[PDB]
């Protein structure tokens, strides 16, 4: 199995309340749900990601990520947010990201596109 | 179908000389592999992301994005690198994207785990 | 005066123990030094910046950002960091932000040049 | 004097036809004016910010950094941009550099208060 495999599985919750479901396979493939407490965004999205299932041993963190294209059959924002960063295990597991959301414009809006933002998703 | 289902699906090319090879399903969903023609890296990685399927008609790109793990069967760079981005259609059809790359580090060199960047793929 | 520039003038301390000393002007300048807790740095480095000196005033925080270069006369780590967020008034006072560090580097390195975090400045 | 005082002083274009002039001092500083084709801004702004005064001679680039806050006599965007990168000397002089646009907000939209991309000047 993935090192942590059943570390990262399961339901996350970041500081907006936002709501990120996910299952870590042992091909380093992770897919879920992805319910955002903010924007414009109702009910589920599909996600999907990777992490590393072999991480060092030295008490580095897991890198991983995952990408929502903000489209479900309520809503569709025309935008896509990617979050990096790692899994960090222990009594208070978390998942520390920073995130780029890119929004579908003009090649005149190009500039204006694309916001960075950074989550933190916590068990509890 | 995807409306940029067609136009996205195939190999793209950055301006490092990176192959980006992905497959785009009409459910929304990327998948491929991709080639780093730099850092710690050699052949082919895994790749899984999302675009929007049903993206605005008025000249606006098609937001996307994906990730890739730096493990496969030659290497484990420890490190994951997400990209958000539009497609942008026509003649010189363009991927644009700003990335986030981390790397799993110890808590106390946290500060320091993420890279930023912006590749700009091409079909030639 | 700038409407915050009593808010802002004084010492600031991060998430990772650095020290951040600002003088506000009425002008929207901010000059001070900053001193590092980690990374290729010793003692106080110059910095400068700019802040909105007529926010809002309907709840919104002040945009502000400065710059650092990682010159002074201990060391020289060739590099600059810019944070870019705002400042948020009340009791629990904070800057918020998100910063950039470029390293000088060769073109062939360009790729690996910048780093992205995010700090959060309080008076405590 | 600094080693690129002369290099970087002058006037600057970057790729949105976005106008950057600055005076590089001996002791790190840079000074000048900005004045930006796009968004929410008119005529000039005060920039301030700071470059490595002694960089490497091995052909790395002079990293630097400065910021705008987007106030001036015409209009308050009550926001403020930083650019981070580095100077690039030769025939093709260029500073490339990744840029946060951080907006004043109340606290319920922080999470989309910053914008990022990337900017290259040159002298023509
Ligand atoms: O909301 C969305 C989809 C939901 C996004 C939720 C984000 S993911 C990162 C973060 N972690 C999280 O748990 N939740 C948030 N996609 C278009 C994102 C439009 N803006 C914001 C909201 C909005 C809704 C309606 C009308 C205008 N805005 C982005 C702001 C912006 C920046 C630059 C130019 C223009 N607009
Ligand atoms: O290379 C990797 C995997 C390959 C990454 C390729 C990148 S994806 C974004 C971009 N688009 C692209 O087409 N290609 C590049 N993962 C660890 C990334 C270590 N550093 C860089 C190289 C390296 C190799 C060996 C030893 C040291 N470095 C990152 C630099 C850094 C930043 C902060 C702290 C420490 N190190
Ligand atoms: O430390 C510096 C100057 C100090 C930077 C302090 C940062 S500002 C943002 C943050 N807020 C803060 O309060 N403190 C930190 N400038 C070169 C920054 C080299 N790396 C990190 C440390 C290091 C020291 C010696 C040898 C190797 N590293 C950056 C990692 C990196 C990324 C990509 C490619 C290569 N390296
Ligand atoms: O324009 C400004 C000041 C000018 C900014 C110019 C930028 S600096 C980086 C870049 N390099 C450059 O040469 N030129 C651009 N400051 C508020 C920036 C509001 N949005 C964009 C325009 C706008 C004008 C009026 C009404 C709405 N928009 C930012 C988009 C956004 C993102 C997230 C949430 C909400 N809005
Ligand atoms: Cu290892
Ligand atoms: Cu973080
Ligand atoms: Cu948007
Ligand atoms: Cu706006
Ligand atoms: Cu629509
Ligand atoms: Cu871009
Ligand atoms: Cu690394
Ligand atoms: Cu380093
Ligand atoms: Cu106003
Ligand atoms: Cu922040
Ligand atoms: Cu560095
Ligand atoms: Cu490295
Ligand atoms: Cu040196
Ligand atoms: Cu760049
Ligand atoms: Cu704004
Ligand atoms: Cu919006």
Same mark, same amino acid.
């Given at each position: 199995? @993935? ?6 599985? =399961? ?16 091909? =380093? ?8 407490? $903010? ?6 999205? $599909? ?11 030295? @008490?580095?963190?897991?890198?991983? @990520? ?19 960063? !790692?899994?960090?295990? @222990? ?6 990201? !920073?995130?780029?959301?890119?929004? =579908? ?10 916001? $960075? ?8």
């Amino acid at each position: 199995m @993935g090192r942590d495999e059943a570390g990262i599985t =399961g339901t996350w919750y970041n500081q907006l309340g936002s709501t990120f479901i996910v299952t870590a396979g042992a091909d =380093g493939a992770l897919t879920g749900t992805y319910e955002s407490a $903010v924007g414009n965004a109702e009910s589920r999205y $599909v996600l999907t990601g990777r992490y590393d299932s072999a991480p060092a041993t030295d @008490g580095s963190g897991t890198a991983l @990520g995952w990408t929502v294209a903000w489209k479900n059959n309520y809503r569709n924002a025309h935008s896509a947010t990617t979050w990096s960063g !790692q899994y960090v295990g @222990g009594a208070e597991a978390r998942i520390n990201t !920073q995130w780029l959301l890119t929004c =579908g414009v003009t090649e005149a809006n190009a500039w204006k596109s694309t916001l $960075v933002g950074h989550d933190t998703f916590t068990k509890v």
